[PDB]
């Protein structure tokens, strides 16, 4: 019973942060194997972040200029290379906290757990989504990039992000682990909009047979529609399309609650067009689109 | 920038996770030092959960029949005995993964982690608050017993709640770690009502400060209060009267933005008289009250 915003247990993450400085800036690194990973702009001073060139300003960077320390300890760097917009400093240490892990570069519509931290130590966790335009909203303060984004199937955690920037409207950016940024945004310090912030139809569809699960059903109708006279009501109230891809992935909650995916579109189609009129789903009075079908299916079964 | 339901890194807890098994129930149990935690209810078959004689059905246990397996290894019971509603079970090998700790008792309004377990397994972590009426909301199948509620103060863990049951409202009732229930549960098959859930008015406050420290100022109007004339509003949407207590605790966040805590209340007056009127704070459509005015100060400032 009960449906609530849950992030994956942080343990197999908290071992892996680190704090790497370099000059006067100080952020977290990923200690993973033999290796650190960490924003580029840890070379930056905050002059250097209006127009840096980082393959120049990493020319003046030697190995002992990266100091990395995990907990109260000193870890000795032995190679530094820069991909993509994460650096790589390669310590003589492996980490004996590493995990089983992946790095993955997920889809814009798919989820993940945070583990904010500054100084190389955690503050906190929290369920996140990549949203349509690459941003995420998260909450991240100064000296909180470096931290990182995550999902764990068993024993095996896929790294999926790493915190780089604040654009000027309170939203963040960042890289997969491989230094890749989701969307056009790049680490400078200059002003970058961001797209239009659609709402993830197939997350909300998951989350309205979450609530069904959960004894939330007055939004059930004796309604039903077709993928395109859906999509023409999510097209007005900037919703994602919504695929056979996204119907197939429902499925499994379609089977268990007996409602059709269509249903639970004209449902989701008639709180568009009415509102919730006061009411509230799971505790919340607008449309949750941050529980992909695989989260609602993990949290209503158990999986561990 | 950003404000989010944000949960303790879980790691201290994942280490003290235990499956307690006794004839054909399986739980989860917390390790800490050479005792292991876990409902009373254990002992209970389906059939016993009716009506318990806890006494008289611990008579027909024995160390032998507690099997506590920690991962994939079995520690050995060399004790066992009641408190309350918990059982402690006294084990030959201290846990090494013991963090600092403390059992704290909480008061209705406080939040806390909870890490959700299943097996002795970790399947997620996310934020509570204990109801004005001592139940949680929380997101807990069968098996998820045992699962513990906690806050923690940089690296001692207070152990403030332990899952026992589902009410038939699907809202969660559990213990302190002395095994004493919050509010008037009993760990009984019997239906148990909860009183009103009132609107932790306190929380609500700390969130508008929260949301006024990140942009979201549109609440904000012309108007102040009297504590006298804000509780008779606070009376009518069923919102727990404010205290002097309350004011005070709200001063950090009344200190940083410049506005007085009988102007926020002002503000809260209004939101209930007039709804939000389509519109959101910190991507909510209603007001949230699982946020302290420490857990406010916290997020926004970066403690870790
Ligand atoms: C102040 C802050 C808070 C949270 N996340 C990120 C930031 N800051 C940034 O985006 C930086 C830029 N541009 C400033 C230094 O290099 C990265
Ligand atoms: C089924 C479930 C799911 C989540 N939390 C708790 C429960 N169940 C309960 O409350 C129990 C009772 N009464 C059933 C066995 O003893 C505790």
Redesign the pocket.
């Known amino acids: 019973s009960g449906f609530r915003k849950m992030a994956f247990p942080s343990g197999k993450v908290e071992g892996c942060m680190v704090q790497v400085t370099c000059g006067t ?1 100080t952020l977290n690194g990923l200690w993973l194997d033999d290796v650190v990973y960490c ?1 580029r ?1 840890v070379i ?1 001073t ?1 002059e250097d ?1 209006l127009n840096p060139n980082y393959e120049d300003l990493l020319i003046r960077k030697s190995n002992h200029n990266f100091l990395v320390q995990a907990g109260n300890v000193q870890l000795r760097v032995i190679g530094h290379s820069m991909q993509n917009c994460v650096l790589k400093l390669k310590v003589d240490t492996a980490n004996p906290k590493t995990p089983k892990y992946k790095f993955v570069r997920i889809q814009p519509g798919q989820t993940f757990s945070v583990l904010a931290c500054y100084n190389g130590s955690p503050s906190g966790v929290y369920q996140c989504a990549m949203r349509p335009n690459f941003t995420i909203k998260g909450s ?3 000296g ?2 470096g931290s990182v984004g995550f999902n764990i199937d068993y024993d095996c955690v896929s790294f999926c992000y790493m ?4 654009l000027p409207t309170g939203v ?1 950016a960042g890289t997969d682990l491989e230094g890749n940024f989701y969307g056009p945004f790049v ?3 200059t002003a970058q909009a961001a797209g239009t912030d659609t709402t993830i139809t197939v997350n909300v569809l998951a989350w309205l047979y979450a609530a069904v699960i959960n004894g939330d059903r007055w939004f059930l109708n004796r309604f039903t529609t077709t993928l395109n006279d859906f999509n023409l009501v999510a097209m007005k109230y900037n919703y994602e399309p919504l695929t056979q891809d996204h119907v197939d992935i429902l499925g499994p909650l379609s089977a268990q609650t007996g409602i059709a995916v269509l249903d639970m579109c004209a449902s989701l189609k008639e709180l568009l067009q009415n509102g919730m009129n006061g009411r509230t789903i799971l505790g919340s009075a607008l449309l949750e689109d941050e529980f992909t079908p695989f989260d609602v299916v993990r949290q209503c079964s158990g999986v561990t």
Chains 1, 2 share one sequence.
Request: charge should be negative.
């Open positions: 800036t924003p702009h930056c905050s972040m991240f303060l100064n909180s990039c915190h780089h920037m604040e963040h680490d400078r310090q």
